[PDB]
Amino acid sequence: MRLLYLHADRFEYKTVKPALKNPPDPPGEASFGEALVVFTTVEDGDGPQTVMYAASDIASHSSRLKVTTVILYPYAHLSSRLAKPMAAHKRLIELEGALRTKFPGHVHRAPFGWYMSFSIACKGHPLAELSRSFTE
Amino acid sequence: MRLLYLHADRFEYKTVKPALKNPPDPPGEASFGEALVVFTTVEDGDGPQTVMYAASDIASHSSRLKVTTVILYPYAHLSSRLAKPMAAHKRLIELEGALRTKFPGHVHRAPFGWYMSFSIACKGHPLAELSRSFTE
Ligand SMILES: Nc1ncnc2c1ncn2[C@@H]1O[C@H](CO)[C@@H](NC(=O)[C@@H](N)CO)[C@H]1O
Ligand SMILES: Nc1ncnc2c1ncn2[C@@H]1O[C@H](CO)[C@@H](NC(=O)[C@@H](N)CO)[C@H]1O
Ligand SMILES: [Mg+2]
Numbered sequence: 046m047r048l049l050y051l052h053a054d055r056f057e058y059k060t061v062k063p064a065l066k067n068p069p070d071p072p073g074e075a076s077f078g079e080a081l082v083v084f085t086t087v088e089d090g091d092g093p094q095t096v097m098y099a100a101s102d103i104a105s106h107s108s109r110l111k112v113t114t115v116i117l118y119p120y121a122h123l124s125s126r127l128a129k130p131m132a133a134h135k136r137l138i139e140l141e142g143a144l145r146t147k148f149p150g151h152v153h154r155a156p157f158g159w160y161m162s163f164s165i166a167c168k169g170h171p172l173a174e175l176s177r178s179f180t181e
Numbered sequence: 182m183r184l185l186y187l188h189a190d191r192f193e194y195k196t197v198k199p200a201l202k203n204p205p206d207p208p209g210e211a212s213f214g215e216a217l218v219v220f221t222t223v224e225d226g227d228g229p230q231t232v233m234y235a236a237s238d239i240a241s242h243s244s245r246l247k248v249t250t251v252i253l254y255p256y257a258h259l260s261s262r263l264a265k266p267m268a269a270h271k272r273l274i275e276l277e278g279a280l281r282t283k284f285p286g287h288v289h290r291a292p293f294g295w296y297m298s299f300s301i302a303c304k305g306h307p308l309a310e311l312s313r314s315f316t317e
C-alpha cells in the first residue's frame with residue numbers, strides 16, 4: 046500500500062466519468078476544511094495486517110498534526126504494483142473501518158472507481174506532505 | 182525519475198520554510214491558469230537519457246491535451262529511490278532545458294529545496310491524472 050499524506054486547509058472532490066465499467070460506489074461530491082487528505086494506492090501484497098498498520102499510522106500522524114478529519118482518497122497513480130479494482134475497493138473499505146477504531150475524528154472515504162476533479166490547498170509546514178508504504 | 186501529471190484548471194505555489202540548509206533556488210510564488218503540473222521526483226539512476234525521455238514524454242502528453250503551459254514541480258514524495266538534493270536539482274535544471282527543445286509553450290520550473298504551500302484545481306477528465314517512470 047502506498048499513501049501520500051497532504052495536510053490541507055481545504056479539500057474538495059467531484060466524481061466525473063466512471064473509470065470502471067461499474068463503479069462500486071455511487072457518484073458524488075464533498076468538501077472539507079482542515080483535514081489530512083490521504084491519497085491511497087492499494088497494492089497487490091496488501092491484506093489485513095497492511096490495513097491495520099496503515100490505520101495506526103494515519104491515526105498517529107493525524108494525532109501529531111492535531112487533525113480531526115481524515116479523507117481516504119482512492120488514487121491509482123502512486124505505485125506500479127497495483128491491486129485489482131475489486132481487491133482495492135475491499136482494502137479501502139477495510140481501511141476506513143480500521144481507521145475508525147484508532148482515530149476519533151471524522152473519517153470520510155471518497156468513492157471508488159471514478160475519474161475525479163479535485164481542489165486542494167495544501168499547507169506549507171514541514172510535515173504537511175509525507176509519503177508512506179505498508180506491507181505484510 | 183517518477184512523475185505525476187496533473188492537468189489543472191489552475192495552479193499556484195508559495196515557498197515557505199527552506200527544506201534544505203541552503204536551497205539552491207531563491208524563494209517565491211507563482212500562479213497559473215490551465216497547465217500541466219508535473220510533480221517530479223528525481224531518482225538515483227537518472228542521467229541525461231532519462232531527462233530527455235521525460236522531456237519528450239511531457240511534450241507529447243501536453244500536445245495530446247492541447248496544453249500550452251507546463252509546470253515542473255520538484256516533489257520528494259513519489260519514490261523511495263531518491264537522488265541526493267544536488268543531483269536532483271541538476272537533473273531538474275536539465276529537464277527544464279530539455280523540455281524547451283521539445284515543447285513550444287510556457288515552461289516554468291518551481292524552486293528547489295523548499296517546503297511549499299500549493300493549490301491546484303485538477304480537472305476531472307480521463308487523462309487529467311497519470312503517472313510516468315523514466316530510466317536509463
Ligand atoms: N489499486 C488501486 N488503488 C486505489 N484506487 C484504485 C486502484 N485501482 C483502481 N482504483 C480506483 O479506480 C479509479 C480508476 O483507476 C481510481 N480513480 C482515481 O485514481 C481518480 N483519483 C482519478 O481521477 C480509483 O478510484
Ligand atoms: N530527489 C528529489 N527530487 C525532487 N525534488 C527533491 C528531491 N530531493 C529534494 N527535493 C526538493 O527538496 C525539497 C525537500 O525534500 C523538496 N520539496 C518538496 O517536495 C515540496 N513540494 C514539499 O512541500 C524538493 O524541492
Ligand atoms: Mg456530480
Ligand SMILES: [Mg+2]
Nearest residue numbers: 195196209210
Ligand atoms: Mg513568499
